[PDB]
Design a protein around this ligand. Sequence first.
Ligand code: 1AL
Ligand code: ZN
Ligand code: ZN
Ligand code: ZN
Ligand code: ZN
Lengths: 410, 411
Amino acid sequence: LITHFRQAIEETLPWLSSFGADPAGGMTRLLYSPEWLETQQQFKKRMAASGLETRFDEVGNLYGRLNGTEYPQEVVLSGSHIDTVVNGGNLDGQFGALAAWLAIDWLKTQYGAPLRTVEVVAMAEEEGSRFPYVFWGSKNIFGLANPDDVRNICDAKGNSFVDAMKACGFTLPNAPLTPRQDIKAFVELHIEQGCVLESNGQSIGVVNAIVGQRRYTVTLNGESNHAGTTPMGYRRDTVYAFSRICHQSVEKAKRMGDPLVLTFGKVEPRPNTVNVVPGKTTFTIDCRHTDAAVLRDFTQQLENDMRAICDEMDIGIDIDLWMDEEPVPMNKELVATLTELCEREKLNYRVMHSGAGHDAQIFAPRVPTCMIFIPSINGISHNPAERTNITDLAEGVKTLALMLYQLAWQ
Amino acid sequence: LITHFRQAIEETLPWLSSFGADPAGGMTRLLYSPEWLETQQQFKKRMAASGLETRFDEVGNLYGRLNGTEYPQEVVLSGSHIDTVVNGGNLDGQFGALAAWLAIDWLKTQYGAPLRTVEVVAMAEEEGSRFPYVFWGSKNIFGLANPDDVRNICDAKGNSFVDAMKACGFTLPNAPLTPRQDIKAFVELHIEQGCVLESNGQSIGVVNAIVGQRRYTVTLNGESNHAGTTPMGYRRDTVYAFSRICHQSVEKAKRMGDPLVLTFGKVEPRPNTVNVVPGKTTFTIDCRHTDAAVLRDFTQQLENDMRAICDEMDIGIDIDLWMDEEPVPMNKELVATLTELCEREKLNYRVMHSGAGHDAQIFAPRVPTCMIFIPSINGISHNPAERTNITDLAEGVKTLALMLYQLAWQK
Ligand SMILES: NC(=O)NC(NC(N)=O)C(=O)[O-]
Ligand SMILES: [Zn+2]
Ligand SMILES: [Zn+2]
Ligand SMILES: [Zn+2]
Ligand SMILES: [Zn+2]
């Protein structure tokens, strides 16, 4: 079965990738761009000619529908986002949507009409790579997006949001949409964007949950001084202070173990010169975990450690916690069905978590949802060097087709 | 005496500071600029009217001479540099030259001509704040300059070193000058540019040595990864590696104790974003000490420590040592005389070292030399806000005058 989809991929993937191709390398889609519009239009046509009822909702999300026989109003959905970042992609997002179409087209030819309605979706924007807003697609599906937060009061480097939208043929609503209550289940296939599958030698990941997140901005204020005339004992060096904090905290994170992660990726000393003790340093913090209580307890302890260190050195501290989102588990029953399914099939799988956010995180709190991971080479993502071995890709489409059978044909 | 020099300063300092005043703030008197020219011409005229024999040497160093009666060929010299940084203060450099003139003028009228000749000097440039070269003034006095190093390396912002020099009435030599060999001693009075004297409520500092210096640029190469999907055990975090290096090295430096200083003042991670493990970091190192062997051995140990940490983390490292200068001690006899003079006058002093370079380091290995420090409030320098209490400035001129009396009016 793996070899069948293998071919389907070789004929469809290169075709889809042509639209939005960037000479500078990789993929460059971006919300409401001429390249965006052409992609959806081309994809909608292909689907319609396949025998599925196609449509665009109010903001550009694309659907492909196959009606069920006894519970036609209960729908099983599957898909991913159609947009990308500025350079390179080809697999992130669009593959999950391509897969759902391949799976559904195959299911219909082998078993005819399903008993429950099944649908494929190509969502508009999951990566705010053009405008200062994220999840414009999935959010409007559940009516969580407020038109005010994007009206004109906001735009990219020149063009207005409302203009680019109407330029593609869609009118910005006057109020939030009506939430969908007809969705019985949602399944999203994505590339992991990591190395865990490769390093443990596997091919399919059963996602149990989506990690919660916390992002800080911290500012330390000491005193700038002559690097040669000021003895060590008279100093209030902000870089040395940062160093004690980073070193100590990273170590602590390591002892706690997976799935905990801690990163200090942006640092800005002032004046930032070789012969001047820096009296100021601005830095960031990024911490994640699957358990809400652990996330809170660990980051709270760090706040106490930073405070203790700085009070000792007599350096002032300013802590700004600007991103605080909780963990998102996947439906308990759906995970069980998928797991026992992998067992039944001789699939080389692994139960794991997602260290990154996906459209799936907004569906989950409203309807039963789950995700399927496929490995990525060298954990590369968001750049042209993104790639996965085709036999792994086929294994993904195959496993997606099986879950959908169990949910709408069984 | 203190109150006499206080009044002298109050009258002359504002006058001299007027030439080179910057509307943008502070002082801006760069090498061979019109402001530089006027300052040197006005100061020379005033010294002449005062009764001194004045002249300019080949590169613009200005002198004020008073000939001695017994050993006319022997010269006791005192002064400092007249140039400044872009928006600096009105004490760094020029005060030292001002004080020498004021001291000699008082000594002259109180005791008459000296046994040996005495000279005031206002050197061309010590900051290198305009052109890419430093010590163009003091280096030429001892024939260490060499014109080929500035003949082409001329560039303020399209301004030629040779042209600005000619614009001021000076022509660069065809070869290194003939070193002076008549200087019996050199004494430089200068602000501390630090906070040691102020913190201890003292007013005079007897310097015994000038520190040596080392500066590096180090690059670390690891790997950039996704901050969420990449487990801790699979990372090559260059910011984590830097912090480990900075933290433990500073620790070792503090244990060593004064006069050792160590600083990591510049850090540049890439890509420098909140959700991306940084795969590259470039940073700097500044280290100084008064003992040549310790300076060399401590930084070499640091070099080995960095390599260990990086090899253990599988991170590539490049170490670039671009500045490496030796420390210079001040003449033992002169230091003794100055120390003894301070006790005798019940002065509130302290013996300390200089954590910064000065023209004095260029004179020391060739002729007996020493320095006198005064306090710097809040240790501020090279900034429009550098200041020093006026009675402390007065104290400095007085100490400088008593020292010159010992060296030239006594046999
Ligand atoms: N060269 C130095 O080490 N010191 C420098 N640092 C200051 N002033 O903070 C300077 O030259 O002004
Ligand atoms: Zn993405
Ligand atoms: Zn994605
Ligand atoms: Zn200076
Ligand atoms: Zn100076």
